[PDB]
Design an enzyme around this catalytic site. Structure first.
Site, PDB file in Angstrom:
ATOM      1  N   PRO B  13      -5.133  11.596  -3.844  1.00 26.69           N
ATOM      2  CA  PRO B  13      -3.736  11.340  -3.474  1.00 26.69           C
ATOM      3  C   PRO B  13      -3.530   9.868  -3.086  1.00 26.69           C
ATOM      4  O   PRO B  13      -4.372   9.293  -2.400  1.00 26.69           O
ATOM      5  CB  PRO B  13      -3.532  12.239  -2.255  1.00 26.69           C
ATOM      6  CG  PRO B  13      -4.559  13.326  -2.407  1.00 26.69           C
ATOM      7  CD  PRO B  13      -5.752  12.637  -3.009  1.00 26.69           C
ATOM      8  N   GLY B  15      -1.785   6.580  -1.184  1.00 24.28           N
ATOM      9  CA  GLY B  15      -1.273   6.339   0.150  1.00 24.28           C
ATOM     10  C   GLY B  15      -2.226   6.633   1.294  1.00 24.28           C
ATOM     11  O   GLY B  15      -1.805   6.692   2.446  1.00 24.28           O
ATOM     12  N   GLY B  17      -5.262   4.829   1.850  1.00 23.68           N
ATOM     13  CA  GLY B  17      -5.905   3.614   2.308  1.00 23.68           C
ATOM     14  C   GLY B  17      -4.932   2.561   2.811  1.00 23.68           C
ATOM     15  O   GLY B  17      -3.839   2.876   3.298  1.00 23.68           O
ATOM     16  N   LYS B  18      -5.348   1.301   2.693  1.00 21.58           N
ATOM     17  CA  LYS B  18      -4.558   0.153   3.129  1.00 21.58           C
ATOM     18  C   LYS B  18      -4.675  -0.967   2.091  1.00 21.58           C
ATOM     19  O   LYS B  18      -5.670  -1.051   1.364  1.00 21.58           O
ATOM     20  CB  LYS B  18      -5.043  -0.337   4.497  1.00 21.58           C
ATOM     21  CG  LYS B  18      -4.932   0.702   5.608  1.00 21.58           C
ATOM     22  CD  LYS B  18      -4.017   0.225   6.724  1.00 21.58           C
ATOM     23  CE  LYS B  18      -4.747  -0.675   7.719  1.00 21.58           C
ATOM     24  NZ  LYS B  18      -3.931  -0.977   8.939  1.00 21.58           N
ATOM     25  N   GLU B  39      -4.647  -1.194 -10.252  1.00 18.66           N
ATOM     26  CA  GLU B  39      -3.482  -0.378 -10.536  1.00 18.66           C
ATOM     27  C   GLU B  39      -2.552  -1.132 -11.482  1.00 18.66           C
ATOM     28  O   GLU B  39      -2.175  -2.275 -11.212  1.00 18.66           O
ATOM     29  CB  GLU B  39      -2.785  -0.068  -9.202  1.00 18.66           C
ATOM     30  CG  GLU B  39      -1.480   0.678  -9.288  1.00 18.66           C
ATOM     31  CD  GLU B  39      -0.891   0.962  -7.903  1.00 18.66           C
ATOM     32  OE1 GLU B  39      -0.670   0.012  -7.122  1.00 18.66           O
ATOM     33  OE2 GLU B  39      -0.666   2.139  -7.590  1.00 18.66           O
ATOM     34  N   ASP B 113      -9.149   1.737 -10.636  1.00 21.70           N
ATOM     35  CA  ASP B 113      -8.085   2.310  -9.849  1.00 21.70           C
ATOM     36  C   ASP B 113      -7.536   3.499 -10.649  1.00 21.70           C
ATOM     37  O   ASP B 113      -6.718   3.321 -11.554  1.00 21.70           O
ATOM     38  CB  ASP B 113      -6.993   1.266  -9.576  1.00 21.70           C
ATOM     39  CG  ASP B 113      -6.097   1.649  -8.393  1.00 21.70           C
ATOM     40  OD1 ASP B 113      -5.990   2.845  -8.085  1.00 21.70           O
ATOM     41  OD2 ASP B 113      -5.501   0.752  -7.769  1.00 21.70           O
ATOM     42  N   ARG B 114      -8.044   4.694 -10.329  1.00 22.60           N
ATOM     43  CA  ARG B 114      -7.687   5.965 -10.984  1.00 22.60           C
ATOM     44  C   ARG B 114      -8.355   6.310 -12.313  1.00 22.60           C
ATOM     45  O   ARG B 114      -8.793   5.442 -13.063  1.00 22.60           O
ATOM     46  CB  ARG B 114      -6.171   6.165 -11.098  1.00 22.60           C
ATOM     47  CG  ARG B 114      -5.488   6.048  -9.759  1.00 22.60           C
ATOM     48  CD  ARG B 114      -4.133   6.712  -9.728  1.00 22.60           C
ATOM     49  NE  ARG B 114      -3.721   6.812  -8.337  1.00 22.60           N
ATOM     50  CZ  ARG B 114      -4.011   7.832  -7.540  1.00 22.60           C
ATOM     51  NH1 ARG B 114      -4.680   8.887  -8.011  1.00 22.60           N
ATOM     52  NH2 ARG B 114      -3.610   7.801  -6.271  1.00 22.60           N
ATOM     53  N   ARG B 171       3.196   1.862   3.481  1.00 27.04           N
ATOM     54  CA  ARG B 171       3.009   1.210   2.180  1.00 27.04           C
ATOM     55  C   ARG B 171       3.596   1.989   1.004  1.00 27.04           C
ATOM     56  O   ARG B 171       2.878   2.441   0.113  1.00 27.04           O
ATOM     57  CB  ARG B 171       1.548   0.800   1.926  1.00 27.04           C
ATOM     58  CG  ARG B 171       0.506   1.915   1.989  1.00 27.04           C
ATOM     59  CD  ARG B 171      -0.856   1.349   1.577  1.00 27.04           C
ATOM     60  NE  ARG B 171      -1.892   2.372   1.449  1.00 27.04           N
ATOM     61  CZ  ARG B 171      -2.292   2.907   0.292  1.00 27.04           C
ATOM     62  NH1 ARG B 171      -1.762   2.523  -0.862  1.00 27.04           N
ATOM     63  NH2 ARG B 171      -3.246   3.823   0.278  1.00 27.04           N
ATOM     64  N   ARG B 173       5.578   2.312  -2.504  1.00 25.76           N
ATOM     65  CA  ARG B 173       5.577   1.490  -3.712  1.00 25.76           C
ATOM     66  C   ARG B 173       7.016   1.268  -4.166  1.00 25.76           C
ATOM     67  O   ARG B 173       7.907   1.980  -3.712  1.00 25.76           O
ATOM     68  CB  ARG B 173       4.702   2.147  -4.790  1.00 25.76           C
ATOM     69  CG  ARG B 173       3.222   1.796  -4.605  1.00 25.76           C
ATOM     70  CD  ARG B 173       2.314   2.817  -5.229  1.00 25.76           C
ATOM     71  NE  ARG B 173       0.925   2.369  -5.296  1.00 25.76           N
ATOM     72  CZ  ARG B 173      -0.011   2.703  -4.418  1.00 25.76           C
ATOM     73  NH1 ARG B 173       0.290   3.476  -3.381  1.00 25.76           N
ATOM     74  NH2 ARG B 173      -1.252   2.258  -4.568  1.00 25.76           N
ATOM     75  N   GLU B 176       9.599   4.103  -4.668  1.00 22.75           N
ATOM     76  CA  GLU B 176       9.045   5.327  -4.101  1.00 22.75           C
ATOM     77  C   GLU B 176       9.928   5.841  -2.972  1.00 22.75           C
ATOM     78  O   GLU B 176      10.482   5.054  -2.204  1.00 22.75           O
ATOM     79  CB  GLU B 176       7.620   5.103  -3.587  1.00 22.75           C
ATOM     80  CG  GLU B 176       7.036   6.310  -2.856  1.00 22.75           C
ATOM     81  CD  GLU B 176       5.553   6.197  -2.596  1.00 22.75           C
ATOM     82  OE1 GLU B 176       5.002   5.081  -2.709  1.00 22.75           O
ATOM     83  OE2 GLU B 176       4.926   7.231  -2.283  1.00 22.75           O
TER      84      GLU B 176
END
Ligand SMILES: Cc1c(C=C(CO)CO)n(C)c(=O)[nH]c1=O
Ligand SMILES: Cc1c(C=C(CO)CO)n(C)c(=O)[nH]c1=O
Lengths: 309, 310
Positions: B13, B15, B17-18, B39, B113-114, B171, B173, B176
């Site tokens: 999921p 959101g 981390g930082k 990303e 990233d993913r 954070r 996006r 979002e």
């Protein structure tokens, strides 16, 4: 191992593909050949409601000005996912049974109504030409084309535009022109790649059919010419790398296909016999396990019963 | 005879981390033996379409407010997910021929990233749970999940929901919206994903346990298969159509050979970075297929970052 012949009958709708295929199947004893038919039930009921109707209604509404391009694009992209699903799953479950390219008669001939590229390349490319899909979405579909299995024989169709139009009229001319152009480009693309054509080398030759035989086509006569769209080009004038990579994928997937052109400009029986003669030059493969053959047969008939008309 | 590669897919999921954690991952890529494929936000906002994230969150908001039909939402979500996953799918396709069999430190560590399943399985499944995607479209995406290559190491995150909400609120996006129903849907899907890999790896057979959805490994009701007891996928007699059953066979085959690692995000960005490094000790490396594979891979990654990384 026993050997398998896979034949995908593809190309524009309305040329006589289905009749020709059925006639060929009819020549065989029940078990030596199996037909994976058009999954019309999926398209009309199981996957969504009346997908074909929704597709043609959306194009018309776009051509009428009743909806925007952006609106048409979301519908067409979404509909093509539904259209393609039966092709994609069938490929996925067939894959582990397919061995290397292997000639004495195959234990089993599997005949398909269309290959995955119909829904993941050709029809999206034609919708793009009709202004109802973005070239970015077309290339997203291209990037998702499954790895090309050994012994992928694809049969495309030739038919004079006049005869094709009449045949279709007796039973959207811009779409017909679009899809005919796309499949002609497809045939040239396979030939271009098998003659050692490198799209990256020839990209600058862009500015403004047959596989199986003939000389190397110009890149301007292949599918690569479709993607010079300003949407895909960086301010400096080159393709963004992300789109260039999708074209690399397109090249990889097509270059190992065995393509044949069937002339549909004849009676149904003549088309059948022409298709039969064509299969003599097609590529067979071994299977993975001895039990692969009955498994494949069951898979095809299950598909046929559930998703066929 | 070929050098070795470590591929690591940071997923789960969003959101948790930082942007400090991310900067370390960029900083991690400074080394010659590591590249970090970021990303592809530029693809989503500009290149593939205009503000795809915004499109997604606006569409759900308007479905929730009743300003559009579920059908209208579904066509938008389905096409948006195509856009979202495109960079993952091309990347995987071009990388695939460079990957050999399974294989001491690796010559190159590639950190993504993913993984493609984020956009072809997990987010589509969450949207199905949000009533904004048909379960048929989800299985169509599943049918196109690329074959699982050796050394497919996927890192998913653990974080208490409250702390996750907090971090996500700070954070967001571009485009979002802070949707707690979606946060719950996506957290559940990834939890089901983790259970699903275990179920499969412990020998679970979905066809054998299917009847238990209407009556040592997780219960099938605690795996992704439970989602596909959706009535849209069933014949009048309650049987799954074969076409959807085949898609579940594909799902099982794709998921079983993935190596899953859980990263605890309930710590500092520096902690998270160290935890990720140590996690690599149990990750599976592969060989590459050609001597030129390593520099090609590096080039791909660098080019991706520069073009589509924010
Ligand atoms: C396969 C395919 C077709 C073709 C058929 C359905 O009418 C049958 O040729 N059509 C018409 C379309 O719009 N998209 C597709 O993916
Ligand atoms: C991957 C993915 C995401 C997640 C990210 C993009 O904001 C976070 O990396 N999101 C938010 C979505 O809606 N669909 C997707 O396929």
């Amino acid at each position: 191992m026993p050997t398998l012949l896979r034949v995908y009958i593809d190309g524009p709708h309305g040329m006589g593909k289905t009749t020709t295929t059925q006639l060929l199947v009819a020549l065989g004893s029940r078990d030596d050949i199996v037909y994976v038919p058009e999954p019309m039930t999926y398209w009309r009921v199981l996957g969504a409601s009346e997908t074909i109707a929704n597709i043609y209604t959306t194009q018309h509404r776009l051509d009428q000005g009743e909806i925007s391009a952006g609106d048409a694009a979301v519908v067409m992209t979404s509909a093509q996912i539904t259209m393609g699903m039966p092709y994609a799953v069938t490929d996925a479950v067939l894959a582990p049974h397919i061995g290397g390219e292997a000639a004495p008669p195959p234990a089993l001939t599997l005949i398909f109504d269309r290959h995955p590229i119909a829904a993941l390349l050709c029809y999206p490319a034609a919708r793009y030409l009709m202004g109802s899909m973005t070239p970015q979405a077309v290339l997203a579909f291209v990037a998702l084309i499954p790895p090309t299995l050994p012994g992928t024989n694809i049969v495309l169709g030739a038919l004079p535009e006049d005869r094709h139009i009449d045949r279709l009229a007796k039973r959207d001319l811009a779409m017909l022109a679009a899809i005919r152009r796309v499949y002609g480009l497809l045939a040239n693309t396979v030939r271009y790649l098998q003659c050692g054509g490198s799209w990256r080398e020839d990209w600058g030759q862009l500015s403004g059919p047959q596989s199986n035989a003939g000389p190397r086509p110009h890149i301007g006569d292949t599918l690569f010419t479709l993607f010079r769209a300003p949407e895909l080009l960086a301010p400096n004038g080159d393709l963004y790398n992300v789109f260039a990579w999708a074209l690399d994928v397109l090249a990889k997937r097509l270059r190992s296909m065995h393509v044949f052109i069937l002339d549909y400009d004849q009676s149904p029986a003549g088309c059948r016999d022409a298709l039969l003669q064509l299969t003599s030059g097609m590529v067979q493969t071994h299977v993975t396990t001895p039990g692969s053959i009955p498994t494949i047969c069951d898979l095809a008939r299950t598909f046929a019963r559930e998703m066929g008309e």
